[PDB]
Short mmCIF file of C-alpha atoms and ligand atoms in Angstrom, two decimals:
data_model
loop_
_atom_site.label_atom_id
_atom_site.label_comp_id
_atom_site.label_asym_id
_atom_site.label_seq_id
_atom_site.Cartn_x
_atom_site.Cartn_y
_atom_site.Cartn_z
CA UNK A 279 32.62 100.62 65.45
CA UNK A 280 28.99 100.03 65.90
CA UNK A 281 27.90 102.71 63.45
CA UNK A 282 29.79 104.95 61.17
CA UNK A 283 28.77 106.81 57.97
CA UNK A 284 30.98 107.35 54.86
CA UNK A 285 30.23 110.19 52.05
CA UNK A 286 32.17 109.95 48.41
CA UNK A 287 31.93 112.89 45.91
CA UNK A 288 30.81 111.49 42.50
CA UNK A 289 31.16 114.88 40.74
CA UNK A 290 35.04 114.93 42.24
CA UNK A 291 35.70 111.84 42.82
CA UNK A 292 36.98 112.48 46.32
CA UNK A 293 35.88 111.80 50.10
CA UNK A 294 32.99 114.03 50.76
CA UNK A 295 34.67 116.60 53.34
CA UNK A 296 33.59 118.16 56.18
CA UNK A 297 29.56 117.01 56.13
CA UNK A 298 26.83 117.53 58.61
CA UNK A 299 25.45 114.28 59.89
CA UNK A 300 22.77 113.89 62.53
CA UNK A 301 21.20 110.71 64.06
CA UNK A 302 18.18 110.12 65.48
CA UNK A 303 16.23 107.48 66.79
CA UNK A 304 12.21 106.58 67.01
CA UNK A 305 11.20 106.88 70.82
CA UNK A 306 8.58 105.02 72.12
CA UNK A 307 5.89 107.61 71.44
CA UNK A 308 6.83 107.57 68.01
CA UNK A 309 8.64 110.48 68.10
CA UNK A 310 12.30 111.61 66.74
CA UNK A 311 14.91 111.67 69.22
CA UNK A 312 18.46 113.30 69.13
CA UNK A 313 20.77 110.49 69.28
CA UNK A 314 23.96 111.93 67.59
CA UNK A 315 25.82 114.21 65.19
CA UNK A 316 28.81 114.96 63.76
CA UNK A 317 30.82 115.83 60.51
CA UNK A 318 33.36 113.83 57.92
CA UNK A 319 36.37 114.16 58.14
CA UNK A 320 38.60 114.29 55.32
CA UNK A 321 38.53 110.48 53.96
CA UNK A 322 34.85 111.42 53.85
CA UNK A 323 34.06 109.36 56.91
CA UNK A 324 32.26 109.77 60.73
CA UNK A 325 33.28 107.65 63.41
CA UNK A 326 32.66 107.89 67.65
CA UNK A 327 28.36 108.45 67.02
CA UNK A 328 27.70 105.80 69.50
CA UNK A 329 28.57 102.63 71.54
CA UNK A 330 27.68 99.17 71.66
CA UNK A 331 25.87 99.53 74.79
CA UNK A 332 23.67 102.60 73.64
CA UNK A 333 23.20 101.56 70.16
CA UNK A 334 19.87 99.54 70.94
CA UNK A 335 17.26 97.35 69.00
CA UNK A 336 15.13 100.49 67.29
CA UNK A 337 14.68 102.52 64.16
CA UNK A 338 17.17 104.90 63.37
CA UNK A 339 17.49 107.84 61.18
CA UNK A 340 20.81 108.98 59.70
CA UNK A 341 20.49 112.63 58.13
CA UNK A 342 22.99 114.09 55.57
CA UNK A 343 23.04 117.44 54.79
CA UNK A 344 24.25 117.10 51.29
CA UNK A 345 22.60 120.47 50.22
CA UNK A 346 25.39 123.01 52.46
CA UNK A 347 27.84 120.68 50.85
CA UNK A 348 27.37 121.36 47.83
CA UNK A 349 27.12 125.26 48.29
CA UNK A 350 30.32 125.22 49.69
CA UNK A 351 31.36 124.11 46.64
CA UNK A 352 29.69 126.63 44.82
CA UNK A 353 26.88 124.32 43.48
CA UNK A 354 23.42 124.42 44.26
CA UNK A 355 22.00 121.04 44.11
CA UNK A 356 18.42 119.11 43.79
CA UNK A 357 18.40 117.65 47.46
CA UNK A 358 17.29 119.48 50.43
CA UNK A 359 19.40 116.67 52.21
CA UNK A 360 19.53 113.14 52.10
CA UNK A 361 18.10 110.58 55.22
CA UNK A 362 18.38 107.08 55.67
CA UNK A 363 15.78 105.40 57.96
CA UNK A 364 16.08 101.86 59.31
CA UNK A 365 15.51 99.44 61.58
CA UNK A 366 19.01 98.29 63.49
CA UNK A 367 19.91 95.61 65.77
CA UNK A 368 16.64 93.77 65.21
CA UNK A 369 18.51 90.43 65.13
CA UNK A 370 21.37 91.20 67.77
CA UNK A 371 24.28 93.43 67.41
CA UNK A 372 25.34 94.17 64.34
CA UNK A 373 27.66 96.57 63.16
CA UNK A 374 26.41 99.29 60.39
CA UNK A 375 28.33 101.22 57.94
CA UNK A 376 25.92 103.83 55.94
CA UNK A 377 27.50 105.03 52.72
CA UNK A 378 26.34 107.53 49.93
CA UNK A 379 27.65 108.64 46.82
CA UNK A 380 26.48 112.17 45.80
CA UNK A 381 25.58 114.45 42.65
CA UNK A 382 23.52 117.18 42.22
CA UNK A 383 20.71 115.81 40.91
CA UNK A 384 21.46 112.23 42.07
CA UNK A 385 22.25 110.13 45.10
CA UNK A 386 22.79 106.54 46.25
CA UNK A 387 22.74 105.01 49.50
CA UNK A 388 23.90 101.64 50.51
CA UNK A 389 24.39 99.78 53.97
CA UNK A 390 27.06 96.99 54.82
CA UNK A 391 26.11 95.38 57.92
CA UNK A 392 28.62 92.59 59.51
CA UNK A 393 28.60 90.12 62.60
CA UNK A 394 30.81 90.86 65.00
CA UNK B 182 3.19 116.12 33.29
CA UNK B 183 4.74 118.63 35.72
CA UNK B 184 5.37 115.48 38.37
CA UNK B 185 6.17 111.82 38.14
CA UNK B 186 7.53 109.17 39.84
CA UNK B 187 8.84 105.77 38.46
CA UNK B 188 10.24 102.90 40.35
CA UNK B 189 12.41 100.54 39.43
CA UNK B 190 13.40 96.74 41.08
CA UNK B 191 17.14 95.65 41.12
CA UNK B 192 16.68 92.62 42.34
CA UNK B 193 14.30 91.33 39.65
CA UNK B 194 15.16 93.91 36.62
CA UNK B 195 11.95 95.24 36.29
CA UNK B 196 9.46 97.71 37.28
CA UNK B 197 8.18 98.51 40.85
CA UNK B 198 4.50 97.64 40.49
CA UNK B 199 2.26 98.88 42.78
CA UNK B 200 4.19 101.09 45.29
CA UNK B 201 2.58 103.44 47.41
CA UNK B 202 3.80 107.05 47.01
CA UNK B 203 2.69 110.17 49.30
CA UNK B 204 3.94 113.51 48.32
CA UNK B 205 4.18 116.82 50.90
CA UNK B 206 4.43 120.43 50.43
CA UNK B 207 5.83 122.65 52.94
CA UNK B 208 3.80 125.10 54.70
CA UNK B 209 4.65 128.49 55.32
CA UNK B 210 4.72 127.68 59.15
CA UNK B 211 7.41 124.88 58.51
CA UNK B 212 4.67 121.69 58.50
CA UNK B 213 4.62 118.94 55.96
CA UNK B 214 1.29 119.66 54.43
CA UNK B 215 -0.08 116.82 52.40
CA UNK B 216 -0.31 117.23 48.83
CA UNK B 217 -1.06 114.32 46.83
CA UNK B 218 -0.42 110.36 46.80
CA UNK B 219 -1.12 107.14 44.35
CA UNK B 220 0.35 103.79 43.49
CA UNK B 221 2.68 102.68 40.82
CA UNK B 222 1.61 101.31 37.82
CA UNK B 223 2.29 98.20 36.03
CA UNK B 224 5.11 99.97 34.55
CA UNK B 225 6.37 101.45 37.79
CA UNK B 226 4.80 104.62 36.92
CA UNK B 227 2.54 107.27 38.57
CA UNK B 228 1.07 109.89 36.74
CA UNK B 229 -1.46 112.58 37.90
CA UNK B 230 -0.19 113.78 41.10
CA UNK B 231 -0.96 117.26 40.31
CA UNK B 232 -1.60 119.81 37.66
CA UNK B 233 0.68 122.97 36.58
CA UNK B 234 -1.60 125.36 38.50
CA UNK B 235 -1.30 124.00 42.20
CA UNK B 236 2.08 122.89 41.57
CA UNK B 237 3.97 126.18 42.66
CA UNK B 238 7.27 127.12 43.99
CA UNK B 239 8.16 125.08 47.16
CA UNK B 240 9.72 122.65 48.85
CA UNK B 241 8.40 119.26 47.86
CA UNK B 242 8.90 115.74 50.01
CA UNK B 243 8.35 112.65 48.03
CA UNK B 244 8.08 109.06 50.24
CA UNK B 245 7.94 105.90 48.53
CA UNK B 246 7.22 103.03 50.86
CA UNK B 247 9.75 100.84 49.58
CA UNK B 248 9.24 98.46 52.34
CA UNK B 249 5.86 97.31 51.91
CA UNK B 250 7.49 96.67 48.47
CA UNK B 251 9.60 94.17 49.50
CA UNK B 252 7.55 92.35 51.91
CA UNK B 253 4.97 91.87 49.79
CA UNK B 254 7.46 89.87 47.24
CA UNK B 255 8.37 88.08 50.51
CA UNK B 256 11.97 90.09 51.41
CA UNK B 257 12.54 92.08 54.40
CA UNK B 258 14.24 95.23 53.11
CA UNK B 259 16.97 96.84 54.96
CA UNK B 260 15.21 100.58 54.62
CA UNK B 261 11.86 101.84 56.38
CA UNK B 262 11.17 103.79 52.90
CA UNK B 263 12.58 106.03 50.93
CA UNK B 264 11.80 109.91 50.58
CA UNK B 265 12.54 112.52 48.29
CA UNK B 266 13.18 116.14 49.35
CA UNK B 267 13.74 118.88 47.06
CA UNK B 268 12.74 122.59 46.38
CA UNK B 269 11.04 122.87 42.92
CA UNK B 270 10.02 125.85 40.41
CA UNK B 271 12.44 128.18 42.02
CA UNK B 272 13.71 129.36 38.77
CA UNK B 273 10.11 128.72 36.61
CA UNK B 274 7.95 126.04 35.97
CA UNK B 275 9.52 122.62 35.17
CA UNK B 276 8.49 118.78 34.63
CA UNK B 277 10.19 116.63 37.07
CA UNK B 278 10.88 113.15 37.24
CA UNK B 279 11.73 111.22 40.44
CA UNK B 280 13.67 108.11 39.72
CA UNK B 281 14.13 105.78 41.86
CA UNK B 282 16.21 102.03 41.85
CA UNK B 283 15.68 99.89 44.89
CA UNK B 284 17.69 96.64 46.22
CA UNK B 285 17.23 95.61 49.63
CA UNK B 286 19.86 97.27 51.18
CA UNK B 287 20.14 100.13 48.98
CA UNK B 288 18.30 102.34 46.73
CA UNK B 289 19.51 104.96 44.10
CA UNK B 290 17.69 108.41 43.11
CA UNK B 291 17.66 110.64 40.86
CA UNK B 292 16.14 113.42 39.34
CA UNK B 293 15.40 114.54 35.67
CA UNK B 294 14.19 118.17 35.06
CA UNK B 295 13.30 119.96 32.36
CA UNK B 296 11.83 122.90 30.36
CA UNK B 297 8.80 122.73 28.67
CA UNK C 110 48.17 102.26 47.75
CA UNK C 111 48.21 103.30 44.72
CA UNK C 112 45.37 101.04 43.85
CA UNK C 113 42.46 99.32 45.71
CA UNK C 114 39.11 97.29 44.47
CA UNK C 115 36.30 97.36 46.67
CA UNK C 116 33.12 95.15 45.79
CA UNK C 117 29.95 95.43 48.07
CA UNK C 118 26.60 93.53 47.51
CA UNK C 119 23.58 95.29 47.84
CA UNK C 120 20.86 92.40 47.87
CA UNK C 121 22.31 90.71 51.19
CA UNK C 122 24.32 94.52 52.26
CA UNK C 123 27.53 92.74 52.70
CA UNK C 124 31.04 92.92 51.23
CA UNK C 125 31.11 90.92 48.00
CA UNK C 126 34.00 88.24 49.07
CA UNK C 127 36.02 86.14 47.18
CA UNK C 128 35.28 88.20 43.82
CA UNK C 129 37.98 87.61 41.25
CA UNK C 130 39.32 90.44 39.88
CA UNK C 131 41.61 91.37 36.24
CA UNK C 132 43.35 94.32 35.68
CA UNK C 133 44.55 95.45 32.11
CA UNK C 134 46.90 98.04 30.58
CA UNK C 135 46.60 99.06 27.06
CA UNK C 136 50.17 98.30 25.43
CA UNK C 137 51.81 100.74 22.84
CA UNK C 138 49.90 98.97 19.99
CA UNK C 139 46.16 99.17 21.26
CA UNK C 140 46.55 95.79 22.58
CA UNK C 141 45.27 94.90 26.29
CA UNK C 142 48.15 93.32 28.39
CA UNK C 143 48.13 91.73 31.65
CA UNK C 144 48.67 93.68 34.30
CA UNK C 145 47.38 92.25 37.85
CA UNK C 146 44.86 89.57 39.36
CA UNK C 147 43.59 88.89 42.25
CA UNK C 148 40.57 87.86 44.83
CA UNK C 149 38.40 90.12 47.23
CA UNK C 150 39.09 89.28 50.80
CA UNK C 151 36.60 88.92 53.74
CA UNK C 152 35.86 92.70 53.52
CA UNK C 153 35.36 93.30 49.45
CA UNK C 154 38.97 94.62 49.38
CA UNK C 155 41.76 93.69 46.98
CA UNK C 156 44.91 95.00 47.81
CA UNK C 157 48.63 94.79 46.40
CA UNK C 158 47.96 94.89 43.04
CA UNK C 159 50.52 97.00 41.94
CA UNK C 160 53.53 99.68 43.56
CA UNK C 161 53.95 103.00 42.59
CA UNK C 162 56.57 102.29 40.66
CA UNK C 163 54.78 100.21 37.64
CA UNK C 164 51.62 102.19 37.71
CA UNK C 165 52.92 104.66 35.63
CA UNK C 166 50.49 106.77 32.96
CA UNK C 167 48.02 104.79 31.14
CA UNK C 168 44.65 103.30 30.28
CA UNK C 169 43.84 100.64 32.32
CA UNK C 170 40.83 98.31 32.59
CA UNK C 171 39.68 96.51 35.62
CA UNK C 172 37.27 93.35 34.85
CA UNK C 173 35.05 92.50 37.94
CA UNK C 174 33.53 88.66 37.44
CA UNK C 175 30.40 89.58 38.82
CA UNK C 176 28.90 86.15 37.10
CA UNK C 177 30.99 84.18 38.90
CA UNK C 178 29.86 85.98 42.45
CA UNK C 179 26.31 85.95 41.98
CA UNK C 180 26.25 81.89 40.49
CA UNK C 181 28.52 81.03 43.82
CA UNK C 182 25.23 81.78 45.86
CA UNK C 183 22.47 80.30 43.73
CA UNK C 184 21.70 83.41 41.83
CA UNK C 185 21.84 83.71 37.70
CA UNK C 186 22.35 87.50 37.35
CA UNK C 187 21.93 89.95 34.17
CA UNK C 188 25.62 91.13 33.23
CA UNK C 189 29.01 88.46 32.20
CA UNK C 190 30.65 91.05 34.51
CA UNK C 191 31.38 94.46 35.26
CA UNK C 192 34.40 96.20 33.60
CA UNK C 193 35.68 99.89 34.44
CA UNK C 194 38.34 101.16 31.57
CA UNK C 195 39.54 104.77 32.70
CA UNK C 196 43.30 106.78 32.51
CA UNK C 197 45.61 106.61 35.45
CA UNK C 198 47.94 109.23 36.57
CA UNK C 199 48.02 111.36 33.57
CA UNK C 200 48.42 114.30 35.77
CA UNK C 201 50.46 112.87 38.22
CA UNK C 202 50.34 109.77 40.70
CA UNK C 203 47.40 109.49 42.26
CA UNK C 204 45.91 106.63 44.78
CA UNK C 205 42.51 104.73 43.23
CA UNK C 206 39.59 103.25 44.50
CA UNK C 207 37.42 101.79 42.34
CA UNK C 208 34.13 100.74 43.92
CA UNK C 209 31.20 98.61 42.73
CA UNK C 210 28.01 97.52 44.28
CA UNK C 211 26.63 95.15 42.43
CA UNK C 212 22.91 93.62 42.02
CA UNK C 213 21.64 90.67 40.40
CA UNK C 214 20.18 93.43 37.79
CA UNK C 215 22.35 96.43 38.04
CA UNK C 216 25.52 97.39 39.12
CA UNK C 217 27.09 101.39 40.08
CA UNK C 218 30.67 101.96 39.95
CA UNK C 219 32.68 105.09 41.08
CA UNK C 220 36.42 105.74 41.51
CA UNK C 221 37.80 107.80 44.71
CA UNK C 222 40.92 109.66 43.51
CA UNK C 223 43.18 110.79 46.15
CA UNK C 224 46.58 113.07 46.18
CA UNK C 225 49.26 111.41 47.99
CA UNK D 280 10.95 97.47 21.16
CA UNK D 281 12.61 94.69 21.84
CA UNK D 282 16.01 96.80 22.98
CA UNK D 283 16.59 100.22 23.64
CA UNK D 284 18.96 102.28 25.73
CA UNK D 285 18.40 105.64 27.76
CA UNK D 286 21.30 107.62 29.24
CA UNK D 287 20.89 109.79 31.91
CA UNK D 288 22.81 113.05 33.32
CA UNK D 289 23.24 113.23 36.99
CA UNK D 290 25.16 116.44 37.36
CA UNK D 291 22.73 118.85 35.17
CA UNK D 292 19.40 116.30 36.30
CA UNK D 293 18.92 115.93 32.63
CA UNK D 294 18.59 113.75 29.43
CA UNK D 295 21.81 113.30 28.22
CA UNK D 296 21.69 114.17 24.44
CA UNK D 297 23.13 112.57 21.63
CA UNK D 298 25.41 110.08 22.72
CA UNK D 299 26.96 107.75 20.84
CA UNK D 300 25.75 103.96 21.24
CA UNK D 301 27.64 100.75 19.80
CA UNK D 302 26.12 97.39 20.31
CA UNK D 303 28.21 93.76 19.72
CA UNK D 304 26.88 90.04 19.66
CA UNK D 305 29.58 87.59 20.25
CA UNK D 306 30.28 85.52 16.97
CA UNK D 307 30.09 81.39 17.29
CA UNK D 308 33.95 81.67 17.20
CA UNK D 309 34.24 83.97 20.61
CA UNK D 310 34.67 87.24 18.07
CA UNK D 311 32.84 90.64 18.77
CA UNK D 312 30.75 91.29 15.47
CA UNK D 313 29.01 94.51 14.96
CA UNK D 314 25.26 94.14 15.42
CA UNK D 315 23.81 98.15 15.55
CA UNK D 316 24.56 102.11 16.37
CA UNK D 317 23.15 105.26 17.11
CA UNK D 318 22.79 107.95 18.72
CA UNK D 319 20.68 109.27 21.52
CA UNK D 320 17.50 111.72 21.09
CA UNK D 321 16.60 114.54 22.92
CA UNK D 322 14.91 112.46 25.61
CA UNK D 323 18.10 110.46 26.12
CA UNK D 324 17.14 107.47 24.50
CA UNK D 325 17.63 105.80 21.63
CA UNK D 326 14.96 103.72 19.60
CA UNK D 327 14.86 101.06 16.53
CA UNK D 328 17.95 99.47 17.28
CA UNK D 329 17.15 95.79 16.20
CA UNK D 330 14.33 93.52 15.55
CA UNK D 331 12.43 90.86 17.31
CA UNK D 332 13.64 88.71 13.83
CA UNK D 333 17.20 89.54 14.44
CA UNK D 334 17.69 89.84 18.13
CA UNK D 335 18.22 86.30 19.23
CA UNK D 336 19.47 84.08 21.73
CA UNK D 337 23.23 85.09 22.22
CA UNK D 338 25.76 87.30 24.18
CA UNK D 339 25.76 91.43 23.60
CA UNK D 340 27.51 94.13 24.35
CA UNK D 341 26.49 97.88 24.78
CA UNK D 342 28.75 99.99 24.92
CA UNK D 343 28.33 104.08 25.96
CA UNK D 344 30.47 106.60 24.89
CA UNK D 345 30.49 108.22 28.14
CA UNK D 346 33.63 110.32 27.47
CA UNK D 347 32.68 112.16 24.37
CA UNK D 348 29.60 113.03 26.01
CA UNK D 349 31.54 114.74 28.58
CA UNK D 350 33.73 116.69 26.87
CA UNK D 351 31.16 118.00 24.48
CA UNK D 352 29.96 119.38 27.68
CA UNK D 353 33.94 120.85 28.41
CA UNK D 354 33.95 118.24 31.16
CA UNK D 355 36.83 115.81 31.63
CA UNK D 356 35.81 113.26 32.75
CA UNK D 357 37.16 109.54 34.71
CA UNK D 358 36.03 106.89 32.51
CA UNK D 359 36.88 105.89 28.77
CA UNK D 360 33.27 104.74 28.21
CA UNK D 361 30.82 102.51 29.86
CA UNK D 362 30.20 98.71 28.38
CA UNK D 363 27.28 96.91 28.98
CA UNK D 364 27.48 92.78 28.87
CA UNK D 365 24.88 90.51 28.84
CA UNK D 366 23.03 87.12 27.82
CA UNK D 367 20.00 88.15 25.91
CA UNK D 368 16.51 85.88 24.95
CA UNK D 369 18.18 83.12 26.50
CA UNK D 370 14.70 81.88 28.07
CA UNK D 371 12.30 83.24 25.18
CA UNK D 372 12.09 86.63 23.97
CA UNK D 373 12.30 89.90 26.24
CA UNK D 374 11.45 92.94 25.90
CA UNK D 375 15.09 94.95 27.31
CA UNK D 376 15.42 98.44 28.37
CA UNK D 377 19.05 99.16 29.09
CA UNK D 378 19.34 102.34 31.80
CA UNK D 379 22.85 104.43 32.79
CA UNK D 380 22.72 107.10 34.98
CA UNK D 381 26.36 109.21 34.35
CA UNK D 382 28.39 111.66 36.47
CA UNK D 383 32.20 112.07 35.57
CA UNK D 384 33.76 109.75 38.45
CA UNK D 385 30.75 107.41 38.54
CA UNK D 386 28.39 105.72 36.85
CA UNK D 387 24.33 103.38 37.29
CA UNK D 388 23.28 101.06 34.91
CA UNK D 389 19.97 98.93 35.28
CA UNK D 390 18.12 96.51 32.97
CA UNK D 391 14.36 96.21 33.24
CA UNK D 392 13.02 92.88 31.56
CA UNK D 393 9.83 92.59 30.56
CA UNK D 394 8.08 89.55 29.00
CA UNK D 395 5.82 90.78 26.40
O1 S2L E 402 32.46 101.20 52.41
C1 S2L E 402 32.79 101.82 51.19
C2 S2L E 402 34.07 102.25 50.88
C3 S2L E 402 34.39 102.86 49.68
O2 S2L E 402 35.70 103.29 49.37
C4 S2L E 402 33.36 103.03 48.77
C5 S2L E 402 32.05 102.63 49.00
C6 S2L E 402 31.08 102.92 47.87
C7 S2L E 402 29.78 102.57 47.84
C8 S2L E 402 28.79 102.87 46.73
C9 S2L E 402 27.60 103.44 47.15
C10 S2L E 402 26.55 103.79 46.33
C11 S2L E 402 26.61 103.59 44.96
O3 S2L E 402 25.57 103.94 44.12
C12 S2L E 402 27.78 103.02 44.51
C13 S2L E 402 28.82 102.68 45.35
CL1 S2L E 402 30.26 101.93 44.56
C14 S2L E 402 31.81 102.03 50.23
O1 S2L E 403 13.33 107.94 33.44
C1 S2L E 403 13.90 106.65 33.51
C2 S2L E 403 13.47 105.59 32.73
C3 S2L E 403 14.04 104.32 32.81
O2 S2L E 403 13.61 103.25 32.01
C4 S2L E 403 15.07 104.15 33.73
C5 S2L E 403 15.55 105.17 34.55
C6 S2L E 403 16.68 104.76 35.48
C7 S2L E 403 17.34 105.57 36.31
C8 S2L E 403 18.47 105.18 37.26
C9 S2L E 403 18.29 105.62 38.56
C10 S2L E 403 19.18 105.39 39.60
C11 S2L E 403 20.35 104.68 39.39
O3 S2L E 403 21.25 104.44 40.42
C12 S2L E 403 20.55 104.23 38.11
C13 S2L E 403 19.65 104.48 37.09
CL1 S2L E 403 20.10 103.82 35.47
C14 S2L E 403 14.93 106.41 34.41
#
């Protein structure tokens, strides 16, 4: 899988269920385009975004929307949402994984890119 | 001080010196309006964004340009930056603190509010 | 699997490989006894450290030799290791993950606690 | 100072108050022998622990007692406590801020080391 993104619950200490996740990508105007979207599923992970052939050298942006999580909890957080931006593929195909760990008033992010 | 931002280095165990910061208020026509900006300190501090009187209910988006960061020590970071997005003084006026902790391929936030 | 050590490296975003890992249960008498070892494999993971059978109820404490990693790649890092002491199953069996991602500097840990 | 420690809250986005701190140096004989205590102000943090006299060269350990905390708070939560180990002074003296940022499944710690 040439991208996937994997939310953990550090309040619960569970998979992060059922979470809004959009992708975008800078286009050569310098605006954002819609590249993809989805939700977790329940081990807290979202696979299928993309392919190897469409997931090109660019910048990407991966959105979370940690804040409707939380609410349908019943907890109204800090975060509007969370975004990771970066640069992919800059170096030839690589595959990404994009993880965060979530509180309320705190998150992490962390990538673990691999060669294929 | 009713905002504040301190950045921390992972990879070196000490402060983010020098960082470029730009904070943006939302307008009531849904634009990021630009509301104040600085550079860290020596201590990876920045003080003196704003005062208590323009500092009113709204939603706030901090950026930290954590990749200049890194290149500047030589490393090419993983992230295009890191921003901040949060809705403040919704329930009164409050001093926040953005933390941040940066590696190269990840970066940890949080947030520490309180009542003065 | 009722229990599973991930390790991920957050200076070169990469699973931490080849991390040796301890595992400890506190005996009757407040002593620590040996419980399970092992090594990360080519993805961070360490699996097969126990069955369901002798993880029963108890403290347990899982050493990470995060020295060891970082020294293997030319780095001298902060902390002799990482260690995560929590109780298991005291409300019935469930499946662990304890995760770390680990810097020269600093280190985060969380556990993903599953119903089977 | 030449060591202090500051514990943060990440589900309340807070100080967190009055926690107990216990800090070991490793005897000459591989022995843990008490070296200082306290507990943590209102700010999270916790001052006058040591000297620059007394804190040499040597091996310590912090540890956080992240589960009393917690419950205080009529929270139960994953870990017994949190342990900080590391070399201190070992290349002249530092100035050492221990950091841990706490949620009940997870926790952050940092050091930032400063040469004064
Ligand atoms: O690919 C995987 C799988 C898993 O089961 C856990 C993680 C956890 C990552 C992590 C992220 C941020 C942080 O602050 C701490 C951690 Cl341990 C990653
Ligand atoms: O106000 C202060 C002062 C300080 O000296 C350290 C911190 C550290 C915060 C922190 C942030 C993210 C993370 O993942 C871990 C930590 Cl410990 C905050």
């Amino acid at each position: 899988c040439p991208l996937m993104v994997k939310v953990l619950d550090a309040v619960r200490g569970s998979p992060a269920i059922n979470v809004a996740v959009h992708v975008f990508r800078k286009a050569a105007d310098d605006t954002w385009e819609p590249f993809a979207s989805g939700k977790t599923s329940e081990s807290g992970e979202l696979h299928g975004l993309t392919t190897e052939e469409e997931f090109v050298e660019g910048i990407y942006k991966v959105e979370i929307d940690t804040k409707s999580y939380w609410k349908a909890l019943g907890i109204s957080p800090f975060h509007e949402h969370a975004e990771v931006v970066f640069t992919a593929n800059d170096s030839g195909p690589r595959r990404y994984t994009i993880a965060a760990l979530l509180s309320p008033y705190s998150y992490s992010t962390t990538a673990v890119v691999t060669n294929p």
